[PDB]
Amino acid sequence: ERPTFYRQELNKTIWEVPERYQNLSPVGSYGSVCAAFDTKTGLRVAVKKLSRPFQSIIHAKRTYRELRLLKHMKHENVIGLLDVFTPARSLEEFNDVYLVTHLMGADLNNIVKKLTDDHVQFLIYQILRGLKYIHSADIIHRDLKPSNLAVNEDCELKILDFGLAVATRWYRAPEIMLNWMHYNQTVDIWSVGCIMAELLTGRTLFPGTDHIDQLKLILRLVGTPGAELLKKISSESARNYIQSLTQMPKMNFANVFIGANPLAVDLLEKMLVLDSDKRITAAQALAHAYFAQYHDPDDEPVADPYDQSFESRDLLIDEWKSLTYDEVISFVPPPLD
Ligand SMILES: Nc1ccc2c(NC3CC3)nc(-c3ccccc3)nc2c1
Ligand SMILES: O=C(c1ccccc1)N1CCCCC1
C-alpha cells in the first residue's frame, strides 16, 4: 500500500512528499533539492524534485534517462537511489517525480577552500573507482567537474549525475571541444586529470574564456598534436584550425607541477594525453603506483550490464511518461544496513 503524503510550499515551488521525510529544507537548484530527515532510516537525505519532468519529448526522455541511470547505480563512489516516489495514484494523473538520495553536504568545488597529497590521493582514487564501475556499464559521464563530486565530512566521495547551481568547458576533453562525434570513455579521465591538477595546485588547470581559448590553453601545456593524432581527424575544418595554430611543444609536467608528488605528476601525464586512444583508462589508473596505499583489485567492482537501447528510440511524450511511471512503480528499496 501507498503511504501518507503531505504538502508544503518552499522555494516559491511546492512539494508533496511522504510522511517519512521530515524537515525539508532547500539547498538550491533540471530541478531543486531539499535536505531532509528520513524517519525510516535515521539518516539525512536529499530529495530532488524534477522541474517539469514531462514538458517536451526531450524533457520526458531526460527524466526517464535519469531514473534508469540512478536506479542502476549500486556502488559506494557513485550516487544511488534511496527512494523514488510521486504524489500520483494513477498513470493518468502522474505528473511529478521526486528523487531521494543520501545527503553528503559539500561538493569538491566548494571544499577546494589546496589539500594534502594523501587527500587528493584518496579523493581521486575514489573518483577513479567510481568511473571504473560507470565505465564498465558502457556509460560515459561527459560532465565530470568539481560540483558533480559530492564529499561528506568523512572525505567520502560520490559521483553525482547533476550538481548544485565554474564552467563546464574547463574540464572537457579537447576532442569534445572539437565536436568529435566519436569520443570514448576517457573523456572522463581527462576531466579527472583536470580536477586532480586543481586539487594539487589550488588553480584551475585550463581557465579558458571560451571554446577557442579553452583549446589554446590545453595545447600550451600538452603540445600541438603530433602527426600520429593529426591523421585521425576526419574533419577538414578542425584539421585546418589546429594545423594553422603555432606549434607549441609539450611542456615538462615536473616543471609545471613543481613539488607535487612525482607519482601524481606521472599520473597527470598519463591522463592529460591529447590522443584519446592512448589516455589511461579508469581501470588502469587505479593500478597506478600513486594509489598503492588505496588500490585493492578484489574490492573495485564493475556494474551489471545497462540497457541503453532506449537512447535510440524516438517516442511520444506520453510514451516516455509511462515508461518512467513503470520505473517508479517497479522500484525496489535497497536493503537498510
Ligand atoms: N583518436 C582520436 C583521438 C583524439 C581526437 C581528437 N582530439 C585531439 C585534440 C585534437 N579530435 C578528433 C577530431 C575528429 C573530428 C573532428 C574534430 C576532432 N579526433 C580524435 C581522434
Ligand atoms: O542532486 C542531488 C540528488 C538528490 C536526489 C537524488 C539524486 C541526486 N544531490 C546533490 C548533492 C548532495 C547529494 C544529492
Side-chain angles (χ1 to χ4, degrees), residues 2-10 13-29 31-112 115-337:
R2 137 199 281 246
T4 319
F5 282 79
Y6 80 88
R7 306 182 126 277
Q8 77 183 68
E9 180 166 315
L10 274 163
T13 186
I14 210 179
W15 291 69
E16 185 165 357
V17 315
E19 207 158 35
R20 132 180 224 195
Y21 304 104
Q22 273 304 321
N23 290 287
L24 275 83
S25 184
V27 18
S29 327
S32 64
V33 179
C34 277
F37 185 80
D38 195 342
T39 60
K40 199 159 140 79
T41 71
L43 306 206
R44 282 227 108 196
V45 299
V47 187
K48 174 178 182 180
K49 177 184 170 204
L50 294 203
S51 186
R52 320 276 200 62
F54 314 110
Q55 117 172 331
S56 64
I57 290 153
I58 308 295
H59 267 220
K61 194 150 176 207
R62 215 209 290 160
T63 285
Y64 176 74
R65 175 175 302 118
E66 153 137 64
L67 196 42
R68 291 284 306 279
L69 280 168
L70 281 176
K71 276 187 60 197
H72 193 80
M73 305 297 90
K74 306 207 224 281
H75 181 287
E76 304 104 309
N77 303 117
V78 181
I79 179 179
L81 256 198
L82 262 12
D83 193 9
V84 57
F85 65 82
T86 179
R89 313 179 126 278
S90 63
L91 181 54
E92 331 176 19
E93 70 185 18
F94 170 61
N95 226 169
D96 307 80
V97 172
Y98 298 74
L99 307 175
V100 177
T101 211
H102 302 93
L103 196 52
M104 305 269 309
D107 63 54
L108 255 206
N109 180 25
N110 96 298
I111 98 109
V112 86
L115 302 160
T116 83
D117 191 275
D118 316 278
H119 284 292
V120 14
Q121 246 179 260
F122 175 51
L123 291 174
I124 304 298
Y125 169 75
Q126 298 181 83
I127 303 178
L128 287 162
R129 176 178 192 267
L131 288 184
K132 214 273 191 86
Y133 170 92
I134 279 156
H135 293 176
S136 77
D138 292 334
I139 298 162
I140 315 185
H141 190 280
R142 273 166 217 99
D143 176 27
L144 263 192
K145 70 174 154 209
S147 28
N148 298 336
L149 301 182
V151 182
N152 69 17
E153 326 64 43
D154 216 24
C155 249
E156 275 162 334
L157 188 139
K158 288 177 203 263
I159 299 158
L160 311 188
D161 60 334
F162 290 106
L164 142 115
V166 68
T168 254
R169 64 180 103 85
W170 296 352
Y171 305 89
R172 276 291 161 86
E175 62 277 26
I176 298 196
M177 294 271 95
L178 283 156
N179 214 29
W180 193 35
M181 297 284 212
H182 292 273
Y183 61 74
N184 58 205
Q185 270 151 188
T186 83
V187 298
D188 289 331
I189 286 295
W190 184 270
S191 296
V192 175
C194 295
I195 282 156
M196 181 155 162
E198 205 177 313
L199 299 188
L200 295 165
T201 75
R203 281 183 180 170
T204 302
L205 233 212
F206 310 114
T209 45
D210 52 46
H211 285 205
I212 297 314
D213 194 53
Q214 190 62 40
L215 194 78
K216 248 188 274 145
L217 305 187
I218 292 165
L219 314 174
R220 167 182 171 78
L221 168 78
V222 301
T224 55
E228 173 185 327
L229 169 47
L230 223 20
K231 69 203 211 208
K232 292 192 261 177
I233 304 173
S234 55
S235 138
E236 236 222 58
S237 27
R239 220 192 300 120
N240 290 200
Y241 181 95
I242 57 192
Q243 280 204 102
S244 304
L245 236 281
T246 316
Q247 266 25 238
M248 303 287 309
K250 196 205 171 203
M251 275 153 195
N252 192 160
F253 277 50
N255 276 10
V256 181
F257 305 107
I258 29 174
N261 179 335
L263 279 173
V265 162
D266 199 55
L267 224 224
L268 277 185
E269 216 126 35
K270 299 194 164 101
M271 289 176 157
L272 300 176
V273 167
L274 222 39
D275 169 5
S276 70
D277 311 334
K278 271 79 231 316
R279 220 169 274 158
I280 201 171
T281 58
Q284 297 155 345
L286 289 156
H288 193 269
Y290 189 63
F291 308 117
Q293 223 210 312
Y294 297 110
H295 181 239
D296 181 8
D298 305 311
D299 185 73
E300 291 166 350
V302 301
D304 298 357
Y306 174 70
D307 180 4
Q308 52 188 137
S309 66
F310 79 84
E311 286 300 356
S312 87
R313 315 250 147 78
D314 307 278
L315 291 181
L316 304 189
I317 183 205
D318 272 355
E319 279 171 330
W320 293 117
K321 171 126 104 93
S322 150
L323 279 163
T324 307
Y325 192 63
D326 294 354
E327 291 293 328
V328 170
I329 299 308
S330 70
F331 170 71
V332 174
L336 202 172
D337 338 305

PDB file of all heavy atoms in Angstrom, residues 174-176 178-181 215 219 225 229 232-235 238 242 274-277 279, ligand 1:
ATOM      1  N   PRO A 174      39.637  17.832 -25.074  1.00  0.00           N
ATOM      2  CA  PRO A 174      39.740  18.655 -26.263  1.00  0.00           C
ATOM      3  C   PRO A 174      38.922  18.075 -27.413  1.00  0.00           C
ATOM      4  O   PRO A 174      38.286  18.842 -28.122  1.00  0.00           O
ATOM      5  CB  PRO A 174      41.237  18.665 -26.570  1.00  0.00           C
ATOM      6  CG  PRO A 174      41.771  17.458 -25.934  1.00  0.00           C
ATOM      7  CD  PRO A 174      40.935  17.228 -24.711  1.00  0.00           C
ATOM      8  N   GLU A 175      38.871  16.750 -27.567  1.00  0.00           N
ATOM      9  CA  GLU A 175      38.104  16.171 -28.693  1.00  0.00           C
ATOM     10  C   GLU A 175      36.593  16.483 -28.646  1.00  0.00           C
ATOM     11  O   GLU A 175      35.958  16.575 -29.689  1.00  0.00           O
ATOM     12  CB  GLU A 175      38.345  14.668 -28.881  1.00  0.00           C
ATOM     13  CG  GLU A 175      37.929  13.801 -27.704  1.00  0.00           C
ATOM     14  CD  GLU A 175      39.003  13.750 -26.593  1.00  0.00           C
ATOM     15  OE1 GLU A 175      39.813  14.697 -26.471  1.00  0.00           O
ATOM     16  OE2 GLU A 175      39.040  12.746 -25.851  1.00  0.00           O
ATOM     17  N   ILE A 176      36.035  16.643 -27.442  1.00  0.00           N
ATOM     18  CA  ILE A 176      34.653  17.055 -27.279  1.00  0.00           C
ATOM     19  C   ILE A 176      34.533  18.520 -27.630  1.00  0.00           C
ATOM     20  O   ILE A 176      33.519  18.947 -28.138  1.00  0.00           O
ATOM     21  CB  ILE A 176      34.152  16.873 -25.834  1.00  0.00           C
ATOM     22  CG1 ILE A 176      34.183  15.398 -25.409  1.00  0.00           C
ATOM     23  CG2 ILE A 176      32.745  17.439 -25.690  1.00  0.00           C
ATOM     24  CD1 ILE A 176      33.363  15.103 -24.156  1.00  0.00           C
ATOM     25  N   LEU A 178      36.359  20.003 -29.914  1.00  0.00           N
ATOM     26  CA  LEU A 178      36.442  19.974 -31.364  1.00  0.00           C
ATOM     27  C   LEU A 178      35.221  19.258 -31.929  1.00  0.00           C
ATOM     28  O   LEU A 178      35.133  19.053 -33.133  1.00  0.00           O
ATOM     29  CB  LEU A 178      37.729  19.269 -31.801  1.00  0.00           C
ATOM     30  CG  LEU A 178      39.013  20.106 -31.684  1.00  0.00           C
ATOM     31  CD1 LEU A 178      40.247  19.213 -31.552  1.00  0.00           C
ATOM     32  CD2 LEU A 178      39.189  21.133 -32.831  1.00  0.00           C
ATOM     33  N   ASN A 179      34.291  18.859 -31.059  1.00  0.00           N
ATOM     34  CA  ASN A 179      32.998  18.362 -31.518  1.00  0.00           C
ATOM     35  C   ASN A 179      33.045  16.966 -32.195  1.00  0.00           C
ATOM     36  O   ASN A 179      32.131  16.590 -32.923  1.00  0.00           O
ATOM     37  CB  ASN A 179      32.384  19.422 -32.452  1.00  0.00           C
ATOM     38  CG  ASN A 179      30.867  19.507 -32.358  1.00  0.00           C
ATOM     39  OD1 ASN A 179      30.263  19.216 -31.314  1.00  0.00           O
ATOM     40  ND2 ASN A 179      30.238  19.921 -33.462  1.00  0.00           N
ATOM     41  N   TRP A 180      34.113  16.206 -31.950  1.00  0.00           N
ATOM     42  CA  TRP A 180      34.220  14.820 -32.404  1.00  0.00           C
ATOM     43  C   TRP A 180      33.016  14.025 -31.889  1.00  0.00           C
ATOM     44  O   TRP A 180      32.712  14.060 -30.688  1.00  0.00           O
ATOM     45  CB  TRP A 180      35.556  14.188 -31.932  1.00  0.00           C
ATOM     46  CG  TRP A 180      35.899  12.870 -32.598  1.00  0.00           C
ATOM     47  CD1 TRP A 180      35.626  12.519 -33.894  1.00  0.00           C
ATOM     48  CD2 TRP A 180      36.607  11.745 -32.023  1.00  0.00           C
ATOM     49  NE1 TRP A 180      36.090  11.253 -34.157  1.00  0.00           N
ATOM     50  CE2 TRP A 180      36.695  10.747 -33.037  1.00  0.00           C
ATOM     51  CE3 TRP A 180      37.162  11.474 -30.750  1.00  0.00           C
ATOM     52  CZ2 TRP A 180      37.314   9.496 -32.824  1.00  0.00           C
ATOM     53  CZ3 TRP A 180      37.779  10.222 -30.531  1.00  0.00           C
ATOM     54  CH2 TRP A 180      37.839   9.248 -31.564  1.00  0.00           C
ATOM     55  N   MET A 181      32.336  13.335 -32.811  1.00  0.00           N
ATOM     56  CA  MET A 181      31.107  12.574 -32.534  1.00  0.00           C
ATOM     57  C   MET A 181      31.424  11.218 -31.925  1.00  0.00           C
ATOM     58  O   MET A 181      30.526  10.463 -31.557  1.00  0.00           O
ATOM     59  CB  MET A 181      30.340  12.320 -33.847  1.00  0.00           C
ATOM     60  CG  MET A 181      29.807  13.568 -34.621  1.00  0.00           C
ATOM     61  SD  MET A 181      28.311  14.358 -33.912  1.00  0.00           S
ATOM     62  CE  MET A 181      27.460  14.999 -35.378  1.00  0.00           C
ATOM     63  N   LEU A 215      40.866  25.466 -25.942  1.00  0.00           N
ATOM     64  CA  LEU A 215      41.780  24.626 -26.678  1.00  0.00           C
ATOM     65  C   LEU A 215      43.181  25.237 -26.692  1.00  0.00           C
ATOM     66  O   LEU A 215      44.174  24.524 -26.490  1.00  0.00           O
ATOM     67  CB  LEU A 215      41.284  24.438 -28.094  1.00  0.00           C
ATOM     68  CG  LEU A 215      41.996  23.316 -28.815  1.00  0.00           C
ATOM     69  CD1 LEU A 215      41.438  22.014 -28.345  1.00  0.00           C
ATOM     70  CD2 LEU A 215      41.835  23.469 -30.318  1.00  0.00           C
ATOM     71  N   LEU A 219      46.641  23.081 -25.428  1.00  0.00           N
ATOM     72  CA  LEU A 219      47.785  22.782 -26.284  1.00  0.00           C
ATOM     73  C   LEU A 219      49.054  23.419 -25.754  1.00  0.00           C
ATOM     74  O   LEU A 219      50.144  22.866 -25.968  1.00  0.00           O
ATOM     75  CB  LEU A 219      47.552  23.239 -27.720  1.00  0.00           C
ATOM     76  CG  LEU A 219      46.220  22.902 -28.359  1.00  0.00           C
ATOM     77  CD1 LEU A 219      46.141  23.574 -29.721  1.00  0.00           C
ATOM     78  CD2 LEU A 219      45.991  21.402 -28.428  1.00  0.00           C
ATOM     79  N   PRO A 225      49.095  18.520 -31.449  1.00  0.00           N
ATOM     80  CA  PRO A 225      49.088  17.105 -31.790  1.00  0.00           C
ATOM     81  C   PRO A 225      50.210  16.782 -32.750  1.00  0.00           C
ATOM     82  O   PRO A 225      50.427  17.516 -33.727  1.00  0.00           O
ATOM     83  CB  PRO A 225      47.735  16.898 -32.472  1.00  0.00           C
ATOM     84  CG  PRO A 225      47.165  18.259 -32.683  1.00  0.00           C
ATOM     85  CD  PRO A 225      47.788  19.155 -31.676  1.00  0.00           C
ATOM     86  N   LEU A 229      48.336  11.741 -34.204  1.00  0.00           N
ATOM     87  CA  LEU A 229      46.980  12.091 -33.852  1.00  0.00           C
ATOM     88  C   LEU A 229      46.363  12.844 -35.004  1.00  0.00           C
ATOM     89  O   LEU A 229      45.159  12.691 -35.283  1.00  0.00           O
ATOM     90  CB  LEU A 229      46.954  12.944 -32.586  1.00  0.00           C
ATOM     91  CG  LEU A 229      45.666  13.658 -32.145  1.00  0.00           C
ATOM     92  CD1 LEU A 229      44.478  12.745 -32.183  1.00  0.00           C
ATOM     93  CD2 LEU A 229      45.837  14.231 -30.736  1.00  0.00           C
ATOM     94  N   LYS A 232      44.139  11.182 -37.489  1.00  0.00           N
ATOM     95  CA  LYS A 232      42.873  10.587 -37.057  1.00  0.00           C
ATOM     96  C   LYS A 232      41.698  11.581 -37.096  1.00  0.00           C
ATOM     97  O   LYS A 232      40.573  11.205 -36.798  1.00  0.00           O
ATOM     98  CB  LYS A 232      43.020   9.923 -35.681  1.00  0.00           C
ATOM     99  CG  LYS A 232      43.917   8.690 -35.743  1.00  0.00           C
ATOM    100  CD  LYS A 232      43.870   7.822 -34.482  1.00  0.00           C
ATOM    101  CE  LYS A 232      45.046   8.079 -33.541  1.00  0.00           C
ATOM    102  NZ  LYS A 232      44.896   7.268 -32.311  1.00  0.00           N
ATOM    103  N   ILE A 233      41.977  12.834 -37.464  1.00  0.00           N
ATOM    104  CA  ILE A 233      40.976  13.905 -37.513  1.00  0.00           C
ATOM    105  C   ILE A 233      40.257  13.976 -38.878  1.00  0.00           C
ATOM    106  O   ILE A 233      40.807  14.480 -39.864  1.00  0.00           O
ATOM    107  CB  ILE A 233      41.592  15.275 -37.167  1.00  0.00           C
ATOM    108  CG1 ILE A 233      42.280  15.238 -35.789  1.00  0.00           C
ATOM    109  CG2 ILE A 233      40.536  16.388 -37.251  1.00  0.00           C
ATOM    110  CD1 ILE A 233      43.096  16.533 -35.430  1.00  0.00           C
ATOM    111  N   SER A 234      39.004  13.499 -38.878  1.00  0.00           N
ATOM    112  CA  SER A 234      38.176  13.216 -40.059  1.00  0.00           C
ATOM    113  C   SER A 234      37.382  14.406 -40.534  1.00  0.00           C
ATOM    114  O   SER A 234      36.246  14.255 -41.008  1.00  0.00           O
ATOM    115  CB  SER A 234      37.143  12.157 -39.667  1.00  0.00           C
ATOM    116  OG  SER A 234      36.392  12.573 -38.529  1.00  0.00           O
ATOM    117  N   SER A 235      37.966  15.585 -40.388  1.00  0.00           N
ATOM    118  CA  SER A 235      37.244  16.837 -40.475  1.00  0.00           C
ATOM    119  C   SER A 235      38.215  17.907 -40.941  1.00  0.00           C
ATOM    120  O   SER A 235      39.101  18.337 -40.191  1.00  0.00           O
ATOM    121  CB  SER A 235      36.659  17.197 -39.115  1.00  0.00           C
ATOM    122  OG  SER A 235      36.821  18.583 -38.854  1.00  0.00           O
ATOM    123  N   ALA A 238      38.515  21.361 -38.502  1.00  0.00           N
ATOM    124  CA  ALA A 238      39.370  21.126 -37.329  1.00  0.00           C
ATOM    125  C   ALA A 238      40.853  20.990 -37.682  1.00  0.00           C
ATOM    126  O   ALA A 238      41.716  21.634 -37.072  1.00  0.00           O
ATOM    127  CB  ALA A 238      38.903  19.880 -36.608  1.00  0.00           C
ATOM    128  N   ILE A 242      43.824  23.569 -36.221  1.00  0.00           N
ATOM    129  CA  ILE A 242      44.960  23.312 -35.316  1.00  0.00           C
ATOM    130  C   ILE A 242      46.322  23.236 -36.022  1.00  0.00           C
ATOM    131  O   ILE A 242      47.362  23.660 -35.468  1.00  0.00           O
ATOM    132  CB  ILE A 242      44.767  22.063 -34.399  1.00  0.00           C
ATOM    133  CG1 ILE A 242      44.513  20.801 -35.203  1.00  0.00           C
ATOM    134  CG2 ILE A 242      43.639  22.275 -33.389  1.00  0.00           C
ATOM    135  CD1 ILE A 242      44.063  19.708 -34.334  1.00  0.00           C
ATOM    136  N   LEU A 274      46.648  14.103 -25.256  1.00  0.00           N
ATOM    137  CA  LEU A 274      45.829  14.607 -26.316  1.00  0.00           C
ATOM    138  C   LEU A 274      45.036  13.490 -26.991  1.00  0.00           C
ATOM    139  O   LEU A 274      43.819  13.529 -27.025  1.00  0.00           O
ATOM    140  CB  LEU A 274      46.714  15.347 -27.311  1.00  0.00           C
ATOM    141  CG  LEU A 274      46.058  16.642 -27.765  1.00  0.00           C
ATOM    142  CD1 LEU A 274      45.371  17.264 -26.584  1.00  0.00           C
ATOM    143  CD2 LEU A 274      47.095  17.573 -28.309  1.00  0.00           C
ATOM    144  N   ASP A 275      45.728  12.477 -27.492  1.00  0.00           N
ATOM    145  CA  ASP A 275      45.104  11.373 -28.230  1.00  0.00           C
ATOM    146  C   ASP A 275      44.407  10.336 -27.337  1.00  0.00           C
ATOM    147  O   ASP A 275      45.043   9.592 -26.585  1.00  0.00           O
ATOM    148  CB  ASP A 275      46.154  10.718 -29.122  1.00  0.00           C
ATOM    149  CG  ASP A 275      45.696   9.408 -29.723  1.00  0.00           C
ATOM    150  OD1 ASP A 275      44.508   9.024 -29.536  1.00  0.00           O
ATOM    151  OD2 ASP A 275      46.546   8.743 -30.387  1.00  0.00           O
ATOM    152  N   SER A 276      43.097  10.242 -27.489  1.00  0.00           N
ATOM    153  CA  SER A 276      42.290   9.521 -26.532  1.00  0.00           C
ATOM    154  C   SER A 276      42.376   7.998 -26.639  1.00  0.00           C
ATOM    155  O   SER A 276      41.849   7.281 -25.786  1.00  0.00           O
ATOM    156  CB  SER A 276      40.845  10.020 -26.577  1.00  0.00           C
ATOM    157  OG  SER A 276      40.202   9.645 -27.782  1.00  0.00           O
ATOM    158  N   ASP A 277      43.042   7.493 -27.675  1.00  0.00           N
ATOM    159  CA  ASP A 277      43.318   6.046 -27.736  1.00  0.00           C
ATOM    160  C   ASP A 277      44.468   5.673 -26.799  1.00  0.00           C
ATOM    161  O   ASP A 277      44.664   4.509 -26.496  1.00  0.00           O
ATOM    162  CB  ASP A 277      43.634   5.593 -29.169  1.00  0.00           C
ATOM    163  CG  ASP A 277      42.609   6.105 -30.197  1.00  0.00           C
ATOM    164  OD1 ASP A 277      41.430   6.377 -29.831  1.00  0.00           O
ATOM    165  OD2 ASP A 277      42.998   6.252 -31.375  1.00  0.00           O
ATOM    166  N   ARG A 279      45.160   7.637 -23.747  1.00  0.00           N
ATOM    167  CA  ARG A 279      44.843   8.069 -22.404  1.00  0.00           C
ATOM    168  C   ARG A 279      44.626   6.827 -21.573  1.00  0.00           C
ATOM    169  O   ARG A 279      44.011   5.860 -22.035  1.00  0.00           O
ATOM    170  CB  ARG A 279      43.576   8.908 -22.428  1.00  0.00           C
ATOM    171  CG  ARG A 279      43.581  10.125 -21.515  1.00  0.00           C
ATOM    172  CD  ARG A 279      42.383  10.941 -21.874  1.00  0.00           C
ATOM    173  NE  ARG A 279      42.633  11.872 -22.989  1.00  0.00           N
ATOM    174  CZ  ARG A 279      41.688  12.398 -23.775  1.00  0.00           C
ATOM    175  NH1 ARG A 279      40.403  12.066 -23.621  1.00  0.00           N
ATOM    176  NH2 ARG A 279      42.033  13.260 -24.730  1.00  0.00           N
TER     177      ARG A 279
HETATM  178  N1  LIG B   1      41.528   9.009 -31.733  1.00  0.00           N
HETATM  179  C1  LIG B   1      41.347  10.322 -31.597  1.00  0.00           C
HETATM  180  C2  LIG B   1      41.959  10.998 -30.548  1.00  0.00           C
HETATM  181  C3  LIG B   1      41.752  12.375 -30.421  1.00  0.00           C
HETATM  182  C4  LIG B   1      40.940  13.083 -31.344  1.00  0.00           C
HETATM  183  C5  LIG B   1      40.730  14.462 -31.244  1.00  0.00           C
HETATM  184  N2  LIG B   1      41.280  15.211 -30.265  1.00  0.00           N
HETATM  185  C6  LIG B   1      42.633  15.780 -30.376  1.00  0.00           C
HETATM  186  C7  LIG B   1      42.828  17.132 -29.700  1.00  0.00           C
HETATM  187  C8  LIG B   1      42.765  17.045 -31.225  1.00  0.00           C
HETATM  188  N3  LIG B   1      39.927  15.041 -32.151  1.00  0.00           N
HETATM  189  C9  LIG B   1      39.336  14.356 -33.142  1.00  0.00           C
HETATM  190  C10 LIG B   1      38.502  15.039 -34.008  1.00  0.00           C
HETATM  191  C11 LIG B   1      37.870  14.386 -35.073  1.00  0.00           C
HETATM  192  C12 LIG B   1      36.996  15.091 -35.925  1.00  0.00           C
HETATM  193  C13 LIG B   1      36.749  16.455 -35.691  1.00  0.00           C
HETATM  194  C14 LIG B   1      37.374  17.107 -34.625  1.00  0.00           C
HETATM  195  C15 LIG B   1      38.235  16.392 -33.781  1.00  0.00           C
HETATM  196  N4  LIG B   1      39.527  13.044 -33.267  1.00  0.00           N
HETATM  197  C16 LIG B   1      40.319  12.396 -32.393  1.00  0.00           C
HETATM  198  C17 LIG B   1      40.535  11.014 -32.509  1.00  0.00           C
END
